[PDB]
Design a protein around this motif. Structure first.
Motif, PDB file in Angstrom:
ATOM      1  N   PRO A  19       0.799  -1.233   0.000  1.00 20.01           N
ATOM      2  CA  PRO A  19       0.000   0.000   0.000  1.00 20.01           C
ATOM      3  C   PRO A  19       0.824   1.272   0.000  1.00 20.01           C
ATOM      4  CG  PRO A  19      -0.093  -1.027   2.126  1.00 20.01           C
ATOM      5  CD  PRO A  19       0.502  -2.035   1.198  1.00 20.01           C
ATOM      6  N   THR A  20       2.113   1.219   0.332  1.00 18.18           N
ATOM      7  CA  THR A  20       2.916   2.417   0.149  1.00 18.18           C
ATOM      8  C   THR A  20       3.124   2.718  -1.319  1.00 18.18           C
ATOM      9  OG1 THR A  20       4.921   3.575   0.825  1.00 18.18           O
ATOM     10  CG2 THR A  20       5.150   1.329   0.132  1.00 18.18           C
ATOM     11  N   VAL A  21       2.938   1.729  -2.188  1.00 18.27           N
ATOM     12  CA  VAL A  21       2.909   2.002  -3.617  1.00 18.27           C
ATOM     13  C   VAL A  21       1.542   2.517  -4.022  1.00 18.27           C
ATOM     14  CG1 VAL A  21       3.187   1.002  -5.891  1.00 18.27           C
ATOM     15  CG2 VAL A  21       4.695   0.294  -4.051  1.00 18.27           C
ATOM     16  N   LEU A  22       0.484   1.904  -3.488  1.00 16.84           N
ATOM     17  CA  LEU A  22      -0.870   2.359  -3.772  1.00 16.84           C
ATOM     18  C   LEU A  22      -1.019   3.838  -3.479  1.00 16.84           C
ATOM     19  CD1 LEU A  22      -2.929  -0.597  -2.319  1.00 16.84           C
ATOM     20  CD2 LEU A  22      -2.703   0.057  -4.695  1.00 16.84           C
ATOM     21  N   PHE A  23      -0.653   4.256  -2.267  1.00 16.92           N
ATOM     22  CA  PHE A  23      -0.844   5.648  -1.889  1.00 16.92           C
ATOM     23  C   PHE A  23      -0.164   6.591  -2.864  1.00 16.92           C
ATOM     24  CE2 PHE A  23       0.925   9.394   0.077  1.00 16.92           C
ATOM     25  CZ  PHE A  23      -0.229  10.054   0.409  1.00 16.92           C
ATOM     26  N   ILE A  24       1.125   6.373  -3.124  1.00 17.56           N
ATOM     27  CA  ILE A  24       1.862   7.297  -3.978  1.00 17.56           C
ATOM     28  C   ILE A  24       1.138   7.501  -5.296  1.00 17.56           C
ATOM     29  CG2 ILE A  24       4.037   7.743  -5.105  1.00 17.56           C
ATOM     30  CD1 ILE A  24       4.108   7.996  -2.148  1.00 17.56           C
ATOM     31  N   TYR A  25       0.627   6.422  -5.883  1.00 15.97           N
ATOM     32  CA  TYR A  25      -0.135   6.588  -7.110  1.00 15.97           C
ATOM     33  C   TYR A  25      -1.480   7.247  -6.849  1.00 15.97           C
ATOM     34  CZ  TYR A  25      -2.818   5.697 -11.238  1.00 15.97           C
ATOM     35  OH  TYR A  25      -3.603   5.852 -12.352  1.00 15.97           O
ATOM     36  N   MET A  26      -2.030   7.087  -5.648  1.00 18.76           N
ATOM     37  CA  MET A  26      -3.234   7.828  -5.293  1.00 18.76           C
ATOM     38  C   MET A  26      -2.916   9.300  -5.095  1.00 18.76           C
ATOM     39  SD  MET A  26      -5.762   5.639  -5.138  1.00 18.76           S
ATOM     40  CE  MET A  26      -6.068   3.898  -4.913  1.00 18.76           C
ATOM     41  N   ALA A  27      -1.823   9.591  -4.393  1.00 19.70           N
ATOM     42  CA  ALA A  27      -1.508  10.967  -4.045  1.00 19.70           C
ATOM     43  C   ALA A  27      -0.885  11.721  -5.207  1.00 19.70           C
ATOM     44  CB  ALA A  27      -0.575  10.995  -2.844  1.00 19.70           C
ATOM     45  N   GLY A  28       0.096  11.127  -5.869  1.00 19.03           N
ATOM     46  CA  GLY A  28       0.698  11.809  -6.995  1.00 19.03           C
ATOM     47  C   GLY A  28      -0.295  12.085  -8.102  1.00 19.03           C
ATOM     48  N   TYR A  29      -1.267  11.195  -8.283  1.00 18.80           N
ATOM     49  CA  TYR A  29      -2.266  11.412  -9.317  1.00 18.80           C
ATOM     50  C   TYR A  29      -2.978  12.737  -9.093  1.00 18.80           C
ATOM     51  CZ  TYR A  29      -6.141  10.438 -12.462  1.00 18.80           C
ATOM     52  OH  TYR A  29      -7.098  10.510 -13.446  1.00 18.80           O
ATOM     53  N   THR A  30      -3.544  12.935  -7.903  1.00 20.47           N
ATOM     54  CA  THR A  30      -4.113  14.243  -7.608  1.00 20.47           C
ATOM     55  C   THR A  30      -3.044  15.317  -7.528  1.00 20.47           C
ATOM     56  OG1 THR A  30      -5.414  15.532  -6.067  1.00 20.47           O
ATOM     57  CG2 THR A  30      -4.059  13.808  -5.156  1.00 20.47           C
ATOM     58  N   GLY A  31      -1.814  14.944  -7.187  1.00 17.69           N
ATOM     59  CA  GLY A  31      -0.746  15.925  -7.174  1.00 17.69           C
ATOM     60  C   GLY A  31      -0.442  16.445  -8.562  1.00 17.69           C
ATOM     61  N   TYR A  32      -0.199  15.536  -9.501  1.00 18.63           N
ATOM     62  CA  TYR A  32       0.160  15.953 -10.843  1.00 18.63           C
ATOM     63  C   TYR A  32      -1.034  16.467 -11.627  1.00 18.63           C
ATOM     64  CZ  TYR A  32       1.932  15.842 -15.548  1.00 18.63           C
ATOM     65  OH  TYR A  32       2.289  16.179 -16.827  1.00 18.63           O
TER      66      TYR A  32
ATOM     67  N   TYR B 201      -3.580  21.487 -14.557  1.00 24.00           N
ATOM     68  CA  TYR B 201      -4.668  22.455 -14.550  1.00 24.00           C
ATOM     69  C   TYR B 201      -4.137  23.866 -14.407  1.00 24.00           C
ATOM     70  CZ  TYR B 201      -8.776  25.050 -13.200  1.00 24.00           C
ATOM     71  OH  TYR B 201      -9.781  25.977 -13.134  1.00 24.00           O
ATOM     72  N   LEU B 202      -3.168  24.062 -13.520  1.00 20.68           N
ATOM     73  CA  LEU B 202      -2.589  25.389 -13.384  1.00 20.68           C
ATOM     74  C   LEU B 202      -1.826  25.792 -14.631  1.00 20.68           C
ATOM     75  CD1 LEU B 202      -1.493  25.267  -9.717  1.00 20.68           C
ATOM     76  CD2 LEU B 202      -3.335  26.571 -10.703  1.00 20.68           C
TER      77      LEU B 202
ATOM     78  N   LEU C 288     -11.585  18.091 -16.246  1.00 18.10           N
ATOM     79  CA  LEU C 288     -11.729  16.679 -16.586  1.00 18.10           C
ATOM     80  C   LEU C 288     -10.632  16.226 -17.535  1.00 18.10           C
ATOM     81  CD1 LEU C 288     -15.579  16.323 -17.230  1.00 18.10           C
ATOM     82  CD2 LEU C 288     -14.330  15.426 -15.281  1.00 18.10           C
ATOM     83  N   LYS C 289     -10.294  17.050 -18.527  1.00 16.77           N
ATOM     84  CA  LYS C 289      -9.239  16.669 -19.456  1.00 16.77           C
ATOM     85  C   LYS C 289      -7.912  16.497 -18.740  1.00 16.77           C
ATOM     86  CE  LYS C 289     -11.971  17.003 -23.067  1.00 16.77           C
ATOM     87  NZ  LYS C 289     -13.205  17.178 -22.260  1.00 16.77           N
ATOM     88  N   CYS C 290      -7.729  17.187 -17.620  1.00 12.43           N
ATOM     89  CA  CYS C 290      -6.531  16.997 -16.820  1.00 12.43           C
ATOM     90  C   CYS C 290      -6.630  15.763 -15.935  1.00 12.43           C
ATOM     91  CB  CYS C 290      -6.273  18.232 -15.976  1.00 12.43           C
ATOM     92  SG  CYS C 290      -4.845  18.049 -14.933  1.00 12.43           S
ATOM     93  N   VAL C 291      -7.781  15.545 -15.297  1.00 13.66           N
ATOM     94  CA  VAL C 291      -7.958  14.349 -14.478  1.00 13.66           C
ATOM     95  C   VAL C 291      -7.747  13.101 -15.315  1.00 13.66           C
ATOM     96  CG1 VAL C 291      -9.601  13.045 -13.128  1.00 13.66           C
ATOM     97  CG2 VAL C 291      -9.430  15.476 -12.826  1.00 13.66           C
ATOM     98  N   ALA C 292      -8.194  13.133 -16.565  1.00 12.93           N
ATOM     99  CA  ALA C 292      -7.889  12.040 -17.476  1.00 12.93           C
ATOM    100  C   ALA C 292      -6.403  11.996 -17.773  1.00 12.93           C
ATOM    101  CB  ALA C 292      -8.688  12.194 -18.769  1.00 12.93           C
ATOM    102  N   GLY C 293      -5.844  13.121 -18.214  1.00 15.02           N
ATOM    103  CA  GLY C 293      -4.455  13.157 -18.628  1.00 15.02           C
ATOM    104  C   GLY C 293      -3.472  12.837 -17.526  1.00 15.02           C
ATOM    105  N   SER C 294      -3.884  12.979 -16.270  1.00 19.53           N
ATOM    106  CA  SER C 294      -2.962  12.774 -15.162  1.00 19.53           C
ATOM    107  C   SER C 294      -2.568  11.318 -14.993  1.00 19.53           C
ATOM    108  CB  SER C 294      -3.576  13.281 -13.868  1.00 19.53           C
ATOM    109  OG  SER C 294      -2.754  12.936 -12.777  1.00 19.53           O
ATOM    110  N   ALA C 295      -3.382  10.385 -15.473  1.00 16.75           N
ATOM    111  CA  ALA C 295      -3.082   8.981 -15.241  1.00 16.75           C
ATOM    112  C   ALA C 295      -1.770   8.610 -15.907  1.00 16.75           C
ATOM    113  CB  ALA C 295      -4.213   8.097 -15.752  1.00 16.75           C
TER     114      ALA C 295
END
Ligand code: CLA
Ligand code: CLA
Ligand code: CLA
Ligand code: CLA
Ligand code: CLA
Ligand code: CLA
Ligand code: CLA
Ligand code: CLA
Ligand SMILES: CCCCCCCCCCCCCCCC(=O)OC[C@H](COP(=O)(O)OC[C@@H](O)CO)OC(=O)CCCCCCCCCCCCCCC
Ligand SMILES: CC1=C(C/C=C(\C)CCC[C@H](C)CCC[C@H](C)CCCC(C)C)C(=O)c2ccccc2C1=O
Ligand SMILES: CCCCCCCS[C@@H]1O[C@H](CO)[C@@H](O)[C@H](O)[C@H]1O
Ligand code: SF4
Ligand code: SF4
Lengths: 32, 88, 163, 155, 80, 740, 142
Positions: free
Chosen positions: C90-103, C108-109, C131-138
């Motif tokens: 889960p320390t891998v899970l989180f980073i991909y959870m957190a960086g996703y919203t991070g990046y 967007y900015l 939305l185009k960013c939330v998609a593109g962030s993956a």
């Protein structure tokens, strides 16, 4: 301990007398 | 309009309120005894210090001397039995 | 075993700890005749709670003396001795959870940056552009390396300092 | 009519007269006290003022002191002695206030009466006028507690 | 007495001089300015320290900077 | 002269301006430059003096928004009846109230939180209720669940009528200024229409519903056999059986002998020793007696017809010699400005709440409030605080009037004028009264604290030791227990039992017994007095020095709410009249908090607990006047002792108090960050973090700025009070819900 | 031209207030305001309360230069009259404060020679070492 009468002599002197003098003299020196 | 700038004493309202004029209202029968009893101590540092040096010495004197002490660890104090802790 | 611990399944206080809860729970539900939902609701929780015990015992967590399952940080310990699911996975899970919203916050900015006045664009989001960013962030890990090596991730030396 | 006015003419002075300031009674009473008179020696005030404050201060000690139980009247002298200390302490305070505010060289800074008239400034201002008062306070301050004791064991 | 000193950067907007509740800053004519005007502080006596000056300066970094010194009867603003 | 006089289609109802935040004030409409524009929006949203100028625009916004609050309160009342309908155990409570504890809220099972459902009674699991709806709904003659759904809907229906009224009276048909300028009409109506009719209407509900119903209950019937409500007013012979005087019809009312109704209209006083409440016969005789008296008092103001007083004459005809021109200015102040008329309202209407907290306490007017102690406590602490804030409202808005709405040309040598002028006298004397009580009120504990620790109990003020007793208060309780003899000849007994009456029991619990005032009771009231003065010092000083003080002559031009003026003059920090309300809230908080700890643990000591027959053993065993003299026993006997209920609860029904208890510490201690710190340190630190976001090119376009000075002071008080009240909330409930 | 003396201009009608002079005025300086009037009306008094200004030249006594310009900003920006005031202290001599040049400082005049100016930008100041143990009030003096 054999000295027993000393605290009754000092503590009042150092708890009251000295704080009475050092209250007066230190005051008179604030204004000259 | 008030002014009288030639007197700045009356422009400040500084007037003493309750000070009277009247000279001594006190009897000469008791006058001549006190008036000469006050100047025995007239002086700045040689008298006030008598009150510190000589006056405050009754704390010293009757704090140690007279046996009027009440529950004082000085004198009467511990006379009963001493408390011991649980361990020692 | 590890660090003077024992798997919770072969633990003991852990087995107290599981079977002391149901007792205090069931003695409570004896006050409700089965025609009451409280007789059902309490029952369902006792069966719900036992499920997790057979889960924690099975999965192989390590309970110390207290009987409460602990965790283990080090990869070389979690991995080799078989339980990495505590943090290491889960320390891998989180980073991909957190960086996703991070990046997804950085693009967007960027997208909203060049305009007449980006300020009103920060208050009031245009959700399509977001939305185009939330998609593109993956897949940001691969898109971060590239802004990293291409040199577009940092803003370099035109930053402002004081003295 | 309106009962309340600024003090004696000018409205722009800080206080303003009211019934407890300028009246028939309050003007006279506060002026009758051995305080504000300009016509009596400062030595004679201290032997008046301090004489009173010894008597009334004894009461709290000689009644509600630490030791309120004695068969020799010691509960009363225990208050007299201590009430005689605030006599001895305040003498240090009084005299201290003299060497601070008043310079032997500087004249009297008191102001002149209430109305139109400039009358000779308060005989107590400078240290001379002040120190005569302080010893005067000490003279009376001893009496007040004393007569308080005499009034305790007699009267 | 507080210290107040003024710098090249003045635009001469007078917006300081309007601020001082004790009227310290007073506009002295000058040359190099766009409006050819510069403030100045003849009284460091009566600067109370409000720093209503420094708030009013339109300049990026201030043309006036008040440096608080010791504080007298006036610079404490005592009515007592 | 008094007409309707409304405009039409004033504004335009559309979303045009919702999408344009800050549209109201000219400064905000420019969009955010910095992050403060987000904050500066909210503080300026309901300030209608910044929006506009004329009273037409202000008042419409004010009046149309009162509908908003009422539309919210009714959605709230509807919700509270609905959860009485479906989710409450009410029926089971209603049949066996002496046992079942009240419950409404039910917790969904998820996340292991269903443990919060406590086993309570009536075969039910849910949260305890301290609100006291159940013990109202019994006194309103509500039995089945259907009456509750009908209120929930009817309450939620009429709520929708208010927002339409709100819409209709701002956008569509908006009154003019002149309409809001009619006080004497408004005061004829409110006093007669609301309170006069609203008492009769309720005096007509009790007579035909509660009085009949609540007789059938304590007679031992249960809701299954109780006739429907419309059975009572549609059947006489049914009603006449309960009270025979209904067979007399309305003749005795008209034939003008009201002694006929002495069965269902009484004058009694005292508590009913079955339900514990006040005898519900005279409460109808209460509202009825008031309603008749309000409608009278609504006719003293003239409107059209030249009968009744005006205002302007009443005020301007009072001139004393001391006061100069008396009240000549007050009328055109109170009709021309809202904040003036708001400070007067929040003053009384605040302290009226605190007064309610004593009465509902001292003489509970509901069936079975005694057997539930958590409800009587929760409603004494509730109304005090709510009355405590609304007082500080008076302190804040009176200051707003000075700074803003106050003009000299209207009031010259006025009562308002002559106050501003001698203000240095008022504040100075009040400032002496506090210091006086400071040593006398509080310091006497320090004596008691010290004389204890020195092993000389002969000294500490106490009952055995030096007697300080509340002579007067004791002497007052003498009259009122001798009152129903001569000064109150027609009565059953004294008004309440806190006077010299005798104990009363229900369900093995003490309804109310008398209360004795000892030395420890004496010493406390003066601490109540000490705090109430000190907190008046701070607010009064805020009003009188709002305009300008001696050190800052311009202060008005700096606004109501501003930080310091200078660092100069030794610094002006926190001199404004918004900042005296900042300070008043810590003394309000302090003042009221101890008002409670006086209450809660006096009431547990000398009243509450189970009736033991012999001994009437209380909750704390009756330790107050001995227990707490010094601050010594407030830690041990009260906070320490009483708090062992909240701490030991985890895995129990009330465990949610154990979390909140700590959670209210964290938020309180968190407040100190904002009070002790200062802006410029926080604005410097943000300068660094921007370097991080810049370096990663993530810099936002709305520039982060640290909170403004007065912003950081507000969020400092917000938590210090919040986190500090929520403790006592969690500390009381966990205490008594376990014990009581 | 600029300076003037103190003729007799009456004082505005007022009924007294606790704001005003104190025992500074005895030993210490105090100020004096003189303006004129056209109509009579009421003005805020900075020491508290309201006062009625006369129909003509008036004279007041305040306790602070601070209080004093509060009243000029008052009457200049509201009733639109000029004001000028004085410093009076018990030794008997009066000074003319306020537009000593004869012009309000807000507006430019000639003949003013300004003090306390620096010909450097702020960043160009000395750092505190370079005045050390020699001493100056601060880096701005040097
Ligand atoms: C070292 C510090 C010190 C000492 C030695 C004392 C000593 C005493 N205190 Mg005290 N006190 C102190 C600090 C101290 N205090 C402080 C800091 C506080 C404030 C927190 C108090 C507050 C306090 C109270 C409120 C009371 C005392 C009392 C007393 C007396 C105890 C009761 C008794 O037997 O009186 C019996 C005393 C006598 C029989 C005679 C004493 C008179 C002496 C002998 C004469 C002293 C001469 C000299 C002129 C005193 C002035 C000194 C100065 C001029 C230098 C005793 C004299 C009690 C008291 O004074 O009542 C009498 C009392 O009520 N204290
Ligand atoms: C602060 C950094 C840090 C520290 C102090 C450790 C500490 C340790 N690592 Mg670890 N590790 C880290 C970061 C760190 N790790 C990171 C970031 C990685 C990258 C994935 C690894 C990958 C890694 C591997 C692949 C191995 C270790 C191993 C070890 C152990 C080394 C031998 C030893 O100390 O005694 C040994 C420790 C004990 C005997 C105590 C066992 C403690 C029980 C199991 C809990 C020790 C527990 C070795 C190991 O497992 O040791 C057995 C090993 O093979 N580590
Ligand atoms: C989405 C934008 C975004 C991004 C990319 C970052 C990135 C960063 N921030 Mg950061 N921050 C943001 C928003 C963002 N922040 C906001 C909105 C705030 C508060 C208003 C902060 C407050 C903040 C502080 C106080 C600190 C950072 C720090 C950091 C750095 C370390 C990361 C870290 O531990 O932060 C941890 C993050 C937090 C503690 C709070 C973040 C809360 C969330 C992420 C904000 C919400 C994001 C937003 C809603 C996304 C909208 C997406 C949509 C528009 C498409 C890193 C450069 C730290 C730093 O400089 O160390 C190097 C640091 O000390 N930031
Ligand atoms: C008792 C609660 C209450 C009430 C009655 C109002 C009432 C009002 N607010 Mg509001 N407000 C409140 C709480 C409240 N507010 C709170 C807690 C905040 C956060 C600080 C705000 C923040 C706020 C802002 C920022 C603004 C208002 C505005 C308004 C006015 C216009 C409302 C409108 O057009 O809605 C009409 C639509 C409805 C009533 C339907 C509401 C449906 C959604 C879900 C809500 C109105 C007077 C606006 C205004 O211009 O007033 C001056 C405005 O700009 N308010
Ligand atoms: C202020 C009064 C109040 C309060 C505090 C509560 C509180 C509660 N109610 Mg409740 N209720 C109320 C009034 C209130 N209600 C009224 C008036 C009614 C009658 C209509 C009901 C009917 C009711 C029922 C029937 C139930 C509750 C339930 C609940 C609980 C869970 C609710 C939940 O999780 O939301 C769930 C949240 C959502 C479904 C969506 C939330 C987010 C949406 C999208 C917001 C909607 C947009 C907008 C902001 C609101 C409407 C505006 C519209 C124009 C768009 C909670 C204790 C439930 C409960 O206790 O279960 C045991 C339950 O079953 N209530
Ligand atoms: C008998 C006549 C009457 C009655 C009962 C009321 C009643 C009320 N007025 Mg009111 N008013 C009246 C005449 C009357 N007014 C007149 C003639 C004027 C002109 C000067 C005003 C001007 C006025 C103002 C300016 C304000 C009020 C407010 C209020 C409310 C008090 C606040 C509150 O807690 O309400 C408690 C609420 C209840 C107990 C709920 C009951 C509410 C229902 C709907 C009854 C309302 C009846 C009312 C007369 C409207 C009926 C006519 C309409 C349906 C066409 C209350 C609803 C205040 C208010 O809330 O503003 C909205 C307020 O600010 N009134
Ligand atoms: C103010 C509210 C209110 C309302 C709506 C009613 C309504 C009613 N009362 Mg009533 N009543 C009230 C207050 C009220 N009362 C008060 C305050 C008293 C005390 C004097 C009474 C005493 C009273 C008696 C003694 C009787 C009624 C009766 C009635 C009913 C028939 C009246 C009738 O025919 O009127 C014509 C339209 C009617 C439902 C009668 C009843 O219940 O039917 C037998 C009846 O006998 N009332
Ligand atoms: C426990 C903390 C504490 C204490 C003791 C005080 C004390 C005081 N505050 Mg307060 N205050 C506090 C916290 C506290 N504050 C906080 C946290 C805030 C933030 C909002 C404020 C905000 C505040 C305001 C805004 C105001 C006060 C005021 C007051 C004073 C009221 C007068 C009074 O009671 O004096 C009496 C003294 C006491 C009760 C202290 C008891 C000490 C004993 C009795 C005396 C000791 C005897 C002897 C001297 C021992 C020393 C001898 C030794 C030197 C040898 C008083 C000094 C008000 C004020 O000054 O106006 C009146 C006021 O306006 N405070
Ligand atoms: C209590 C004193 C009392 O009630 O006085 C009442 C006294 C009577 O005032 P008048 O009779 O002039 O005022 C009556 C009318 O003027 C009210 O508008 O007014 C005072 O002077 C107020 C005293 C405040 C000073 C507090 C002392
Ligand atoms: C802590 C502290 C700060 C720092 C605190 C700040 C800057 C508060 C800012 C934090 C806010 C709440 C973050 C807001 C986050 C946005 C709302 C974005 C959230 C979006 C979703 C995640 C909801 C001050 O600026 C300050 C100023 C003056 C006196 C005291 C203090 C003070 O004590
Ligand atoms: C439907 C739930 C999500 C709410 C947001 C959906 C609308 S998205 C919305 O579209 C508008 C079109 O004019 C734009 O003005 C606005 O910027 C954009 O955010
Ligand atoms: S100092 Fe700032 S404000 Fe005063 S003039 Fe020069 S620039 Fe304009
Ligand atoms: S701080 Fe000194 S200089 Fe700046 S305005 Fe206030 S007084 Fe004038």
């Amino acid at each position: 301990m054999n000295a027993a009468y000393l605290p009754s002599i000092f503590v009042p002197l150092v708890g009251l007398v000295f704080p009475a003098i050092a209250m007066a003299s230190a005051f008179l020196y604030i204004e000259k | 309009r008030y002014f009288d700038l030639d007197d700045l004493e009356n422009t400040l309202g500084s007037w003493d309120m309750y000070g009277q004029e009247d000279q001594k209202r006190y009897p000469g029968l008791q006058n001549e005894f006190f008036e000469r009893a006050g100047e025995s101590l007239t002086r700045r540092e040689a008298i006030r210090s008598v009150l510190f040096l000589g006056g405050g010495g009754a704390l010293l004197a009757w704090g140690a001397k007279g046996a009027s002490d009440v529950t004082l660890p000085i004198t009467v104090g511990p006379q009963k039995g001493g408390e011991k802790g649980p361990k020692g | 075993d590890i660090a003077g611990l024992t798997p919770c399944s072969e633990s003991k206080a852990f087995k107290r700890r599981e079977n002391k809860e149901v007792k205090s729970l069931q003695k409570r539900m004896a006050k409700y005749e089965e025609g009451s939902a409280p007789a059902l609701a309490l029952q369902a929780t006792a069966e719900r709670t036992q499920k997790r015990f057979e889960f924690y015992g099975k999965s192989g967590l390590l309970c110390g003396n207290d009987g409460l399952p602990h965790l283990i940080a080090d990869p070389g310990l979690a991995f080799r001795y078989g339980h990495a699911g505590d943090i290491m996975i889960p320390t891998v899970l989180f980073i991909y959870m957190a960086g996703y919203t991070g990046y997804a916050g950085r693009e967007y900015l960027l997208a909203t940056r060049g305009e007449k006045k980006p300020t009103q664009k920060e208050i009031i989001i245009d959700v399509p552009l977001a939305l185009k960013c939330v998609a593109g962030s993956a897949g940001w890990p691969l898109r971060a390396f590239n802004d990293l090596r291409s040199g577009s991730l940092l803003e370099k030396e035109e930053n402002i300092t004081v003295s | 009519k309106q009962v309340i006015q600024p003090i004696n003419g000018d409205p722009f002075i800080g206080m303003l007269e009211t019934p407890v300031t300028s009246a028939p009674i309050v003007a006279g009473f506060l002026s009758n006290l051995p305080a504000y008179r300009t016509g009596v020696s400062p030595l004679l005030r201290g032997v008046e003022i301090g004489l009173t404050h010894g008597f009334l201060v004894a009461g709290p000690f000689i009644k509600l002191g630490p030791l309120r139980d004695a068969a020799g009247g010691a509960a009363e002298t225990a208050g007299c002695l201590s009430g005689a200390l605030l006599v001895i302490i305040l003498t240090a305070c009084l005299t201290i206030y003299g060497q601070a505010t008043f310079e032997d060289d500087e004249p009297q800074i008191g102001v002149k009466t209430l109305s139109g008239r400039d009358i000779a400034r308060d005989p107590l201002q400078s240290a001379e006028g002040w120190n005569e008062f302080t010893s005067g306070w000490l003279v009376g301050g001893l009496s007040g507690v004393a007569w308080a004791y005499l009034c305790t064991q007699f009267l | 007495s507080h210290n107040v000193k003024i710098y090249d950067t003045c635009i001469g907007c007078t917006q300081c001089v309007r601020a001082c509740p004790t009227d310290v800053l007073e506009m002295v004519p000058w040359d190099g300015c766009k409006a050819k005007q510069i403030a100045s502080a003849p009284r460091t006596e009566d600067c109370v320290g409000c720093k209503r000056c420094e708030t009013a300066c339109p300049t990026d970094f201030l043309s006036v900077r008040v440096y608080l010194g010791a504080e007298t009867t006036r610079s404490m603003g005592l009515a007592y | 002269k008094v007409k309707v006089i409304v405009d039409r289609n004033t504004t335009d109802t559309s979303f045009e301006k919702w999408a344009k935040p800050g549209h109201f004030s000219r400064t905000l409409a420019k969009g955010p430059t910095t992050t403060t524009w987000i904050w500066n929006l909210h503080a300026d949203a309901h300030d209608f003096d910044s929006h506009t100028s004329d009273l037409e625009d202000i008042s419409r916004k004010v009046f149309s928004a009162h509908f908003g609050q009422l539309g919210i309160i009714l959605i709230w009342l509807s919700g509270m009846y609905f959860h009485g309908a479906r989710f409450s155990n009410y029926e089971a409570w209603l049949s066996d109230p002496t046992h079942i504890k009240p419950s409404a809220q039910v917790v969904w099972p998820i996340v292991g939180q269903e443990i919060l459902n406590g086993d309570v009674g009536g075969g039910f699991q849910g949260i305890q209720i301290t609100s006291g709806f159940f013990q109202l709904w019994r006194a309103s003659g509500i039995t089945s669940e259907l009456e509750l759904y009908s209120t929930a809907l009817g309450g939620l229906l009429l709520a929708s009528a208010m927002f339409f009224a709100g819409w209709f009276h701002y956008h569509k048909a908006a009154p003019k200024l002149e309409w809001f300028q009619n006080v004497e009409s408004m005061m004829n109506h409110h006093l007669a229409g609301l309170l006069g009719l609203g008492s009769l209407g309720w005096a007509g509900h009790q007579i035909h519903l509660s009085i009949p119903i609540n007789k059938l209950l304590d007679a031992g019937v249960d809701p299954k056999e109780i006739p429907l409500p419309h059975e009572f007013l549609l059947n006489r012979e049914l009603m006449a059986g309960l009270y025979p005087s209904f067979s007399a019809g309305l003749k005795p009312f008209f034939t003008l002998n009201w002694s006929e109704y002495s069965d269902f209209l009484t004058f009694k006083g005292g508590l009913n020793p079955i339900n514990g409440g006040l005898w519900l016969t005279d409460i109808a005789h209460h509202h009825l007696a008031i309603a008749v008296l309000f409608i009278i008092a609504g006719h003293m103001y003239r409107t059209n017809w030249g009968i009744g007083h005006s205002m302007k004459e009443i005020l301007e005809s009072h001139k004393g010699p001391f006061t100069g021109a008396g009240h000549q200015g007050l009328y055109e102040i109170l009709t021309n400005s809202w904040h003036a008329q708001l400070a007067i309202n929040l003053a009384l209407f605040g302290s009226l709440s605190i007064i309610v907290a004593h009465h509902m306490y001292a003489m509970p007017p509901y069936p079975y409030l005694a057997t539930d102690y958590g409800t009587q406590l929760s409603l004494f602490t509730h109304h005090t605080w709510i009355g405590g804030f609304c007082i500080v409202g008076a302190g804040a808005h009176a200051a707003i009037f000075m700074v803003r709405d106050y003009d000299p040309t209207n009031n010259y040598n006025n009562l308002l004028d002559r106050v501003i002028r001698h203000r240095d006298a008022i504040i100075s004397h009040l400032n002496w009264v506090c210091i006086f009580l400071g040593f006398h009120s509080f310091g006497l504990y320090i004596h008691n604290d010290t004389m204890s620790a020195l092993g000389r109990p002969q000294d500490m003020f106490s009952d055995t030791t030096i007697q300080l007793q509340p002579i007067f208060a004791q002497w007052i309780q003498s009259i009122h227990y001798a009152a129903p003899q001569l000064t109150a000849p027609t009565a059953s007994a004294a008004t309440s039992l806190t006077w010299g009456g005798d104990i009363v029991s229900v369900g093995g619990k003490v309804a109310m017994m008398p209360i004795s005032l000892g030395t420890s009771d004496f010493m406390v009231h003066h601490i109540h007095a000490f705090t109430i003065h000190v907190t008046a010092l701070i607010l009064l000083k805020g009003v009188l020095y709002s305009r300008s003080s001696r050190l800052i002559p311009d202060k008005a031009n700096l606004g109501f709410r501003f930080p310091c003026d200078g660092p100069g003059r030794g610094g002006t920090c926190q001199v404004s009249a918004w900042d005296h309300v900042f300070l008043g809230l810590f003394w309000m908080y302090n003042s009221l908090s101890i008002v409670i700890f006086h209450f809660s643990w006096k009431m547990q000591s000398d009243v509450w607990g189970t009736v033991s027959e012999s001994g009437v053993s209380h909750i704390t065993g009756g330790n107050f006047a001995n227990s707490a003299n010094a601050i010594n026993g407030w830690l041990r006997d009260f906070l320490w002792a009483q708090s062992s209920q909240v701490i030991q609860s985890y895995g129990s029904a009330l465990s949610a108090y154990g979390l909140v208890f700590l959670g209210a510490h964290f938020v309180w201690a968190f407040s100190l960050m904002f009070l002790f710190s200062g802006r410029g340190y926080w604005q410097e630190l943000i300068e660094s973090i921007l370097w991080a976001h810049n370096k990663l090119k993530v810099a936002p376009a709305i520039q982060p700025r640290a909170l403004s000075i007065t912003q950081g002071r507000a969020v400092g008080v917000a938590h210090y009070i919040f986190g500090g009240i929520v403790t006592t909330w969690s500390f009381f409930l966990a205490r008594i819900i376990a014990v009581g | 031209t600029p300076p003037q003396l103190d003729p007799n201009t009456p004082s505005p009608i007022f009924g007294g207030s606790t704001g005003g002079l104190l025992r500074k005025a005895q030993v210490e300086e105090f100020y004096v305001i003189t303006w004129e009037a056209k109509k009579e009306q009421i003005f805020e008094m900075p020491t508290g309360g309201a006062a009625i200004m006369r129909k003509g030249p008036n004279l007041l006594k305040l306790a602070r230069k601070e209080q004093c310009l509060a009243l000029t900003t008052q009457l200049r920006t509201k009733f639109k009259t000029d004001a000028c005031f004085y410093r009076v202290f018990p030794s008997g001599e009066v000074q003319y404060l306020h537009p000593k040049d004869g012009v309000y400082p807000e507006k430019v005049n000639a003949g003013r020679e300004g003090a306390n100016q620096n010909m450097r930008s702020i960043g160009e100041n000395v750092n505190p070492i370079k005045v050390k143990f020699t001493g100056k009030i601060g880096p701005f003096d040097v």
